[PDB]
């Protein structure tokens, strides 16, 4: 409902306590005009979990559509049973850094001009439908970094545990 929980705090690692030098950093699969972070096969429980899979969306051009896919509880039996997504009101609410901590922010006021359709292919633009999308504005005046979380690390199967997914969107100034 476009509200923010100003009391919500987290970190990039969350409860995994994984150091940043141990993140699996990779770039988004960019189709030139759509930068996609697809977690559909990145977070399944393994004996080596939890890992931090961090998809980096680097934007320096105008009107880029950002798409983020986070597996849904029940999409596969058991594999995503305790998956959580943050912020729950994404893409309207996003996370940004307050020094070490991550705090909920309205993307409306963080990047003015940014386009969020209420629907993505006829379904609500919310992680509860599996996908969020937002198209960045034609002008960005300052460098801006915000975050989404798709965390499956609390899903476990015997000695297997899922992975914590992070989307880091790094927007360089363009336009002006």
């Amino acid at each position: 409902l476009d509200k923010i929980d100003l009391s919500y705090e987290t970190t990039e690692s969350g409860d995994t306590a994984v150091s940043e030098d141990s993140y699996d950093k990779y770039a988004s699969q960019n189709t030139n005009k759509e930068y996609v972070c697809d977690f559909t096969d990145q977070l399944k429980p393994t004996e080596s979990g939890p890992k931090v899979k961090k998809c980096e969306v680097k934007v320096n051009e105008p009107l880029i559509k950002v798409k983020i896919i986070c597996p849904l509880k029940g999409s596969v039996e058991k594999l995503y049973d305790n998956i959580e997504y943050v912020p729950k009101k994404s893409p309207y609410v996003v996370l940004t850094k307050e020094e070490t901590k991550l705090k909920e922010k309205l993307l409306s006021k963080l990047i003015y001009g940014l386009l969020i359709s209420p629907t993505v292919n006829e379904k609500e633009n919310n992680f509860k439908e599996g996908v969020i999308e937002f198209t960045l504005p034609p002008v960005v005046h300052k460098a801006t970094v915000f975050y989404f979380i798709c965390d499956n690390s609390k899903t476990e199967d015997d000695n297997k545990k899922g992975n914590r997914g992070i989307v880091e969107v790094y927007v360089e100034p363009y336009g002006n």
Partner: single-chain antibody
Amino acid sequence: TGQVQLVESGGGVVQPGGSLRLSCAASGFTFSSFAMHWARQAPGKGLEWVAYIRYDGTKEFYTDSAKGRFTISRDNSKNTLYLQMDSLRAEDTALYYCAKDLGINSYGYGGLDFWGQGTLVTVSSEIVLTQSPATLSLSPGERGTLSCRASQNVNRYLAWYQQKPGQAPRLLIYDASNRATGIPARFSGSGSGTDFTLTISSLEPEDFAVYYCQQRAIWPPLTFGGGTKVEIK
């Protein structure tokens, strides 16, 4: 439940190279929903994890010393756990506990959240957790602080146990910070990665006991610290 019960049997005195079949009658919970552990405490020593069986009995894990000698099995229609022990050796002398796993609804596997009283077996002749100090002399009312240091990142998957004299271990804290149900609030946990702490805000006379940390981040094997004894000055 508040009526959970585990009753081990089948122990006894055997010579090296002999066999024993341990049994554990499970009561008070949905046995078929929970993985089960065997653990053991050698005379005068700390806690060691032995074996784990999946809720449906289709996957089993073992400590290296038990591989090829011990077989963990279960009958979900008899709510009974078994440990077939073959080719026994003098170092297998220990009190053998059956323990119920903490895991349910896809979270908690590796923690031993309830222990039976145990059955003694006498054979008549890895992530490392460091607990310091080994002994802690304190007075009733003082704040006790126990430390656990892991050889590598165990995330926040560290549990704490209390073994009062003569008694089975009891889960106090799981995943670093989460007090188990029924545990008084004077017990608190903190830490992440490699360094962890258990705080007992005001020691009560019953709190003077041995305490063990345990990791479920990477297993098998499930590993315990050496234990910290909290004595009266």
